[PDB]
Design a protein around this ligand. Structure first.
Ligand SMILES: [Zn+2]
Lengths: 269, 49
């Protein structure tokens, strides 16, 4: 904050805020003056456009059959490109770019400006309602894959929508990372435990059998048993320490004191 | 021997008795709490179906 001139220039050049905003002291802090998040957000669309245009450019080079690398400093803010200084020419339909340094540098911004919220509207338009997701759907896989393809098309590494299918750990990281970004799009009433009705001694229960982690995708419990006769101790325990039966036996809560997403209440007071 | 050994027989028998007492009370508490939590479960569901 000693000298963020270029940042100020960029911020006013795109009407995210007017120079008047730069006297409200602690404008740069986050926990002080949380409003800064809003004015940061007013950049998202420009970033998203840059992304789409670079996808187009990648495929263009691929068809053209050229090889090269993509550095940010060779990209305007509108999305265009230039400075084809050292690309080399090969047979068409066989060309290949290098988008490893590009995205790897860009990745922190995309959650800073939330430049991917424009995909939660009924048709990728800021000026339209949100997609009315089905309250019951919880899978969401080929959706993540589709997003990946529409943006990160040439991120030359396999992405696994469910870390369960990861190899080592470094794959777990390289997948949960993308999952973090993508999980900002979907309804927040569709994460957490994934319960299911079961029977024991001819009696219905509700217990969790899996989970939908906003960073790990879907995970299903591996040893669930429908229809049992009695309950030993450990199973008593694991069905007592779970929220499922507790929550579902609760009365609906909505509190305005906190922006944290409430869930349920267990009493009348 | 018999007026010292026999003095240790009592000691060891009585500590065995007290430890079996403690184990009995322990396993008692177990039954009590498991009954309680079973009751809690069975009464919880009886408000939702
Ligand atoms: Zn993986």
């Amino acid at each position: 904050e000693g000298n963020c001139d270029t940042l100020k220039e960029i911020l006013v050049t795109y009407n995210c805020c007017d120079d008047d905003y730069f006297n409200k002291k602690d404008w740069y802090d986050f926990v002080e003056n949380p409003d800064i998040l809003r004015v940061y957000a007013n950049l998202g669309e420009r970033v998203r456009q840059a992304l789409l245009k670079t996808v187009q450019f990648c495929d263009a080079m691929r068809n053209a059959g050229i090889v090269g690398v993509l550095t940010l400093d060779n990209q305007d803010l509108n999305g265009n490109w230039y400075d084809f200084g050292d690309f080399i020419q090969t047979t068409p339909g066989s060309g290949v770019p290098v988008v490893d340094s590009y995205y790897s540098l860009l990745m922190p911004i995309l959650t800073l400006t939330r430049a991917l919220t424009a995909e939660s509207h009924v048709d990728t338009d800021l000026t339209k309602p949100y997609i009315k997701w089905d309250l019951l759907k919880y899978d969401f896989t080929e959706e993540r894959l589709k997003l990946f393809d529409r943006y990160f098309k040439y991120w030359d590494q396999t992405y696994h929508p469910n870390c369960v299918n990861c190899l080592d750990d470094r794959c777990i990281l390289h997948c949960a990372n993308f999952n973090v970004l993508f999980s900002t799009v979907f309804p927040p009433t569709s994460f957490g435990p994934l319960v299911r009705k079961i029977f024991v001694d001819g009696v219905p229960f509700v217990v969790s059998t899996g989970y939908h982690f906003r960073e790990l995708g879907v995970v299903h419990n591996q040893d669930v048993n429908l229809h049992s006769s009695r309950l030993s101790f450990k199973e008593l325990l694991v069905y007592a320490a779970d929220p499922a039966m507790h929550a579902a036996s609760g009365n609906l809560l909505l509190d305005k004191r906190t922006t944290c997403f409430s869930v349920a209440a267990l009493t009348n007071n | 021997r018999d007026a010292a050994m026999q003095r240790k027989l009592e000691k060891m028998a009585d500590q065995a008795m007290t430890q079996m007492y403690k184990q009995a009370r322990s396993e008692d508490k177990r039954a009590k709490v498991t009954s309680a939590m079973q009751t809690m479960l069975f009464t919880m569901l009886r408000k939702l179906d």
